């Protein structure tokens, strides 16, 4: 029989009335700037698919950022641009400014506006209360934006949310792993980081959409209001849906499962245990406890959810209460 068929619950058929142009990334034609405006300054981080450098735009000297993609999955490379073109302008998107091509690697090279980046390492010890629902606010401008242009990040990490601190603005980056939703379209469960794959993508069912972010999204709240980075601290894919089961618990798991008619991988069957859902108040203490509201905790709880199809929607999550209190623009 095999695995039951999903759909998102929002943004369902939004490439299916644009033109074809706009999501068939393989046909785009690559228009190319010049190389030479740009002079790099020093090499800010290598990546698994690129080498990320600050560079200097010398036709109006500002600060730019040179994304140099390796060699490798050529698909990957359209994709990537069509995406940050179709977003560009949208709020809190990452602003991709041009494309070269870089003489030396002989691939393309992504340039992007310049944000002053607080190390997000150091900027979750710090954040208040406040700032972790101003913050988590302006993230969502961004994951309801893409969602509504039918695209899917799917790979929503601290490290890709890129924060300007002292000016209060927020940047999502790295479209490297987004795709554009297709309803009933099998996708690859090999993406996002460990510590962030939801649910979907640890018992292997490829036809997930949009709500995956926001399982992603509910890790990096539930890492910040409760001071544990990362919170689900898996040491390999499998130990990872363990320590999910462990505060979600296994009867829910397997209600999921069942749902959808997945089989879970056999070897989960002397690993998994037995586990009751545990109660948010659990993870609570001293060192946290200012960080946490009912609010923030309904608000966890509607994100963290097995069945992707029950998850909050980016929209309907910035009506909660949790954001009653964030100053609107
Ligand atoms: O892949 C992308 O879309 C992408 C877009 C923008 C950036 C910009 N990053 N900036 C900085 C950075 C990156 C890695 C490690 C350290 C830093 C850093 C430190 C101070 C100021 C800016 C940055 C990257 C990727």
């Known amino acids: 029989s095999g695995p039951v068929p999903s759909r998102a619950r929002v943004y369902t058929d939004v490439n299916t009335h644009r033109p074809r142009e706009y999501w068939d990334y393989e046909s785009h034609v690559v228009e190319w700037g010049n190389q030479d405006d740009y002079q790099l300054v020093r090499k800010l981080g290598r990546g698994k698919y690129s080498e990320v450098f600050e560079a200097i735009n010398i036709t109006n000297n500002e600060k730019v950022v040179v994304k140099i993609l390796k060699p490798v999955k050529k698909k990957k490379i359209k994709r990537e641009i069509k995406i940050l073109e179709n977003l560009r302008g949208g709020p809190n998107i990452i602003t991709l400014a041009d494309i070269v091509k870089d003489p030396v690697s002989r691939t393309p090279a992504l340039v992007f506006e310049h944000v002053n980046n607080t190390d997000f390492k150091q900027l979750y010890q710090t954040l208040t209360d406040y700032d972790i629902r101003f913050y988590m606010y302006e993230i969502l401008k961004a994951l309801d ?128 245990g037995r586990h009751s859902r545990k109660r948010w108040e659990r993870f609570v203490h001293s060192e946290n406890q200012h960080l946490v509201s009912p609010e923030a905790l309904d608000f966890l709880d509607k994100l963290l959810r097995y069945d992707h199809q029950s998850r909050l929607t980016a929209r309907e999550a910035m009506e909660h209460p949790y954001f009653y209190t964030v100053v609107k623009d």
């Open 145 to 272: 934006y893409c969602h509504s242009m039918g695209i899917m990040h799917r790979d929503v990490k601290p490290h890709n949310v890129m924060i300007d601190h002292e000016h209060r603005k927020l940047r999502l980056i790295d479209w490297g792993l987004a795709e554009f939703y297709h309803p009933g379209q099998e996708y690859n469960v090999r993406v996002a980081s460990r510590y962030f794959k939801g649910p979907e993508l640890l018992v292997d069912y490829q036809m997930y959409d949009y709500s995956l972010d926001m399982w992603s999204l509910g890790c990096m709240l539930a890492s910040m209001i409760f001071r544990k980075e990362p919170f689900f601290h898996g040491h390999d894919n499998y130990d990872q849906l363990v320590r999910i089961a462990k505060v979600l618990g296994t009867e829910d798991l397997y209600d999921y499962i069942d749902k959808y008619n997945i089989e879970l991988d056999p070897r989960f069957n002397d690993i998994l």
